[PDB]
Write a protein that binds this ligand. Structure first.
Ligand SMILES: Cc1nc2c(S(C)(=O)=O)cc(CCc3nc(N4CCCC4)nn3C)nn2c1C
Ligand SMILES: [Mg+2]
Ligand SMILES: [Zn+2]
Length: 312
């Protein structure tokens, strides 16, 4: 049967946490199938249903600067690297669910925060009062799973299907960063008082939530030139949202005000110190073989410090 294979440099570097999937959009589906096949098996999904699923998922990501199809596949590769470094820790259903959740986690993102949708009074803000975009992404995921010929989970029992859709729902909701701060504190406490227990389902759920935040933020774990150019896309969105806040008669927060372009380096410091480093530190305590993500994060913080010192 039909293995996907990658050129040599990608075959070796895809295994590393800091891999960048590259600028050739047409290779991203093959990269994803490659990662399914190694992390899950050639048996996990029917190739034709999987291919069809991946292509409808792509079609439902919008042409926005950051929250686009490249982000989806990027977050899926970080999950691949976590799963492959922690072979025996995860169930077969988790292996199945988590790469799908990662590919799907920002489906139909419009380039605006939950907060902007609430202030604009978008219909989605009435349908979903918290984690607005994330409930939308999970909804789009179910929609695409229900298209004819798209049920990649059709070989699972009813109860196994319900479990996988529940891993996916929780993994996608956990990407709402408003939820991360508390998830991470609870995990920091359970790990330190030694109550953390991977047989407890509500504990796995938290650990998979943190994994989701870690994959989602994985821009900060790349080689410096990747990190730095990705920040440009991240701000291109924030600043467009800022413009849209000013159109509603609202001062955006500094993060979203393009008049604060000059403070970016200091904004990245606060973000590495308040969000990124805590994220990868707690993740490395729970899952020691994820340490290269923390190391890469720390290398990038120290590059932002250099930019501030005028050394860059
Ligand atoms: C992967 C990645 N995720 C993010 C996010 S997130 C997870 O919210 O999506 C936010 C940020 C912006 C952080 C920030 N910038 C500023 N300023 C800009 C100039 C004035 C103030 N303040 N703050 C807090 N960066 N980022 C990165 C590199
Ligand atoms: Mg999101
Ligand atoms: Zn995302």
């Amino acid at each position: 049967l039909m293995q996907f294979t990658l050129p040599v440099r990608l075959c070796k570097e895809i295994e590393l946490f800091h891999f960048d999937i590259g600028p050739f959009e047409n290779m991203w589906p093959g990269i994803f199938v490659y990662m399914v096949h190694r992390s899950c098996g050639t048996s996990c999904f029917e190739l034709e249903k999987l291919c069809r699923f991946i292509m409808s998922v792509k079609k439902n990501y919008r042409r926005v600067p950051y929250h686009n199809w490249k982000h989806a596949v990027t977050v899926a590769h970080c999950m691949y690297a976590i799963l492959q470094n922690n072979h025996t820790l995860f169930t077969d259903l988790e292996r199945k669910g988590l790469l799908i959740a990662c590919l799907c986690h920002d489906l139909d993102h419009r380039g605006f925060s939950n907060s902007y949708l609430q202030k604009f009074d978008h219909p989605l803000a009435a349908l979903y009062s918290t984690s607005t975009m994330e409930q939308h992404h999970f909804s789009q995921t179910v929609s695409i799973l229900q298209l004819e010929g798209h049920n990649i989970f059709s070989t699972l029992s009813s109860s196994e299907y319900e479990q996988v859709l529940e891993i996916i729902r929780k993994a996608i909701i956990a990407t709402d960063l408003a939820l991360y701060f508390g998830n991470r504190k609870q995990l920091e406490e359970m790990y330190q008082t030694g109550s953390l227990n991977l047989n407890n389902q509500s504990h796995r759920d938290r650990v998979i939530g943190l994994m989701m935040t870690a994959c989602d933020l994985c821009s900060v774990t790349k080689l410096w030139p990747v990190t730095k150019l990705t920040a440009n896309d991240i701000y291109a969105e924030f600043w467009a949202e800022g413009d849209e806040m000013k159109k509603l008669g609202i001062q955006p927060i500094p993060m979203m005000d393009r008049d604060k372009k000059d403070e970016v380096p200091q904004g990245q410091l606060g973000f590495y110190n308040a969000v990124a480093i805590p994220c990868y530190t707690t993740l490395t305590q729970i899952l020691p073989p994820t340490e290269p993500l923390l190391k890469a994060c720390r290398d990038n913080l120290s590059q932002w410090e250099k930019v501030i010192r005028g050394e860059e």
